[PDB]
Design a protein around this ligand. Sequence first.
Ligand SMILES: NCCc1c[nH]c2ccccc12
Length: 305
Amino acid sequence: PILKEILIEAPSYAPNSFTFDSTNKGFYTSVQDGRVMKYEGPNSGFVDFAYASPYWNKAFCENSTDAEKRPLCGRTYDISYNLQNNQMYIVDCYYHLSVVGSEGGHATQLATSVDGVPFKWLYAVTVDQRTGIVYFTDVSTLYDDRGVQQIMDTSDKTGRLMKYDPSTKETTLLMKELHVPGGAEVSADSSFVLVAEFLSHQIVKYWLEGPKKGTAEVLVKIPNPGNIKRNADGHFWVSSSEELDGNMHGRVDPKGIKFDEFGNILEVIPLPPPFAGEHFEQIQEHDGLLYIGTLFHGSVGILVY
Ligand SMILES: NCCc1c[nH]c2ccccc12
């Protein structure tokens, strides 16, 4: 059991998710100061790709580490490409669900609420390449970005799972009263969606098709599960930030856990330095590489394993 690690220093801070386009050269990642950047390669580096915020601007926003800059600058928490039509969905804390074309730029806003209840902190997003439908997650109806302590203190259980349907332009609520839903992923065959409930330490399976349609059930339990991303095999990687002292201020034992559509663990990878001892967001398999997204490091981590 060998580990090779690549550390790519990013601009801004906190590259926390990734997605990949048809060309499949380099990658896209969202960062602290509101941008989604694109990595071309070593020589080429990172360039601006898109901004959720209508108002993102360089002088005021670039490389901010001030949280009271987020309401204007945005903070995007997840991005997912639609490969057939080269289009990128964005979920941003402050500018909610939007999309951008191949060309990047400021995103076009697509939804700010469901069932009359405004989104407070959109978090996870995924495109079902077969249907073109978008599944995403809102972590709270009360607290945003700068309210994490409250989320933990009240043990907030107002999270939501929605679908967006490009063709009808309709947002549909699929589940409510989720326990901090920090990850969501669609199955390869479009039959079910998975959501990680952070404070419940569980992956939940929601059926899109078949006799169990419209119903959910606990698929597997994992300590402090974050982002979930499907790989080419149709399996699922999720981040596990095991809080061994039962809260964010004690020891953390972060692992990437790969599982399958039947709740079987296939793989457990404990994170090496520098992610060891600390929470992380996402582990994503792509082309034999494992991308590590975090909310506290200034570098992309990639594991070869
Ligand atoms: N970082 C692992 C998951 C996580 C951390 N902070 C969160 C806040 C809300 C939801 C999930 C998270």
